[PDB]
Write a protein that binds this ligand. Structure first.
Ligand SMILES: [K+]
Ligand SMILES: [K+]
Ligand SMILES: [K+]
Lengths: 256, 256, 256, 256
């Protein structure tokens, strides 16, 4: 188990914010957290449309974000307020997700107020600002608190690291081998889409995995001879470590 | 078992219309029902061609439908006429399929006679009438009475609801994650098909499941780096709960 | 076992033409049959090129066929010459393959000599003559005499007829359902490739099985909503009876 | 086990160059070999770009190759210098990979110096020189010394030769059968991409394996009827001997 605060207000509060099975208020708090997470995801994925892109203070999009960040920060602060051991809090993982999901809103807001008002700046960089906007998407994983499915998935992926390594390794070797073969089989032809070996990598990964987008396909006979072998060998290299991961997931899931 | 009427005419009739193993007439009735269902499906799927679309009373298409509806209604009425318990009849499922397959023909016919003759109407709506035409397709499931395969499938799908939930959940998370990544990796380029994050959802679902229609594919290098990972992760998220459903079906089917 | 002729010449001959494990000559005869089969297949698949198509007596293509038919007929006649029981010969299957592979050459040749010389004819029909040319391809299955793999495959396919029926049935139901849904979701749009429900069948089969050729894909949002579900449900309906057939093949193959 | 030299310098040297678990220097040597292999692969795959292609002595690309070949030759020579039995050295496989990876650099260099200086030559041939450049790619397999994954893969592929034969055989039969059917179903149409049976082979292999590049697809109804059956039968013929190979790999990998 875990220690309990065994006190007057703090123990009651921590049982409220930690165990959704306790009472009516615990279920209410949990549903509130789920609703706010969903709202924030929709806001993030919606503000990127062509229509509102155009070319702050009262915009509809800029409000909702502040409300969601307020609620996340309040929840994190209260949850940390009554926590028995600090070492466990540091060693956890959900708290890392929460703090990472709260950081970017402070950085963006913080950066604009100080610099624009009292300095001349590029932005920072086109790349730097763009990079942050992307990190803002980790709010999905806050649903790990409310579903056993994601936690089972996390444990399965942690247990099976080595097989992931093997799968990527076999894919890499196959990609290099077949890219080289099909580039050299089509150098003499003028009308070929393969300009260099680093350009056939995309074709090799899209053919081994059986997606086959349809651009860059062989035309010479020597090209087709190799494009068949790539298709055949993709299945063989892909399907080797799948049973291990499926077995791990099934055991972790049906365990209880 | 089930109670039997244990009477003079009604018991004989219900044994005729319920158990196709009894006699010659039972087999004849069953084959008649199968023929009529097939005819009705062909009529529904055939009257939609470009040729007879053009821009009622004696049309070839409008007759056959009335005959099929007559036979379905007669069969349902007779089957319900001699039924021991009403609660079982309400709690069943095949009867729901039958009544749902009979409703739309009455609504369409019923609506035209009263309104056109004595009122001015839009139709109802373009959408409303169009919506009903689609519901007319549930006549296929009336074959659940005549094949063990469909009933095995129904039981398997009922038992494995949770794994279906998990599969859709993992797909949804993967879709959002990779759509966001590949939209942000291709914002700077002018010649890109991805205008907004809600526009990359189609690409993500068509790549994770390995269909790969071939429109909307990445062009920048940063786009290709992510389009490879989507292809790899689609297999992993798809192939997790398949063994459970296959095991359920195999057990339900080979049970007897 | 099987009866043996137990005689002077006929028993020796039948042991020569039936059991390739006996002696050196048996192995020589077997290799000769394999070489002739391969030659005939190459001739059939080669005479169809654009170059020799253009718009008989001494053509290179017309000779080789007569030689191969001569050898096949000689082998069949000798094999039947010393056969203990006639009922077994009729009830076999390899002999059916041999006679079916020998028939078309006689029909084509036979038809030209009598009719052209003494009558005026269309050909017979464009379709009739074309149909026969296709039947000429059953010469491949004569390799069932020389590989255990094909015979294992034949036994597996014979044992698992019912699961094949179920697979086709589920595919048919899924095809009709999703074709109807995606035709009705795209009637209002002008620029759609789906003209009628019988036209969406091709899209449904190419999407459920995850080939995805790339013509005929949805454009409206309502179309995409259904095109995702088709992709998901294809895997589910395809992957149900595969384990049974794989188990049958594995048992029949590893049995000995 | 294996014999040990049991001597003063040679035994110490062979333990250094053979067992990376011994000491610090053994780990250093192993990491050096890995770094050099990776460098050489990058050089080979990088010198083929459009930019440095243009239309030796001090080029950046021509140096690095000489350094890598020097190190490979030194390592091979030292490893062979202290080897107990010659028969084992000949019967090994890693040494074959090393000598094959060292040969091409000598041939290319050797050929240019003698012939250009004292003779007039074509090159040798466009094909001959091109063929060698391709063989230069076997440097990847030198990583078999430093990963258990590749060695497990080698043992699995050696054990399962027969199932590979069966898979290719079933694919070949299916390809011929469906190519013939879909060529004859589309001869009458003018606007068809299938000019001859040898031209439909590419379509058959790309459809059976479910890649589906998207050129060459059927247009007539008779063509679509067969293009569906090809898609269905590809899964059946592909998925038969996969369980055997997966079982072999799993046993060899989880053995220890
Ligand atoms: K696929
Ligand atoms: K495709
Ligand atoms: K595909």
């Amino acid at each position: 188990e875990r220690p309990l605060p065994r006190r007057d207000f703090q123990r009651q509060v921590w049982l409220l914010f930690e165990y959704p099975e306790s009472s009516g208020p615990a279920r209410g708090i949990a549903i509130v957290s789920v609703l706010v997470i969903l709202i924030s995801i929709v806001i993030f994925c919606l503000e990127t449309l062509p229509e509102f892109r155009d070319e702050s203070f009262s915009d509809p999009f800029f409000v909702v974000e502040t409300l969601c960040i307020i609620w996340f920060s309040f929840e994190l602060l209260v949850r940390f307020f009554a926590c028995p051991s600090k070492a466990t809090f540091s060693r956890n993982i959900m708290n890392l997700i929460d703090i990472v999901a709260i950081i970017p809103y402070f950085i963006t807001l913080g950066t604009e107020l100080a610099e624009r008002q009292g300095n001349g700046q590029q932005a920072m960089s086109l790349a730097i600002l763009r990079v942050i906007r992307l990190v803002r998407v980790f709010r999905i994983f806050k649903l790990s608190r409310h579903s056993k499915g994601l936690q089972i998935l996390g444990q399965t992926l942690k247990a099976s690291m080595r097989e992931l390594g093997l799968l990527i390794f076999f894919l890499f070797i196959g990609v290099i081998l077949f890219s080289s073969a099909v580039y050299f089989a089509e150098a003499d032809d003028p009308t070929s889409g393969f300009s260099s070996i680093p350009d056939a990598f995309w074709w090799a990964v899209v053919t081994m995995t059986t997606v086959g987008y349809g651009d860059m396909h062989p035309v010479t006979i020597g090209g087709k001879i190799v494009g068949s072998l790539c298709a055949i060998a993709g299945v063989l290299t892909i399907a080797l470590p799948v049973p291990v991961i499926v077995s791990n997931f099934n055991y972790f899931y049906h365990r209880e």
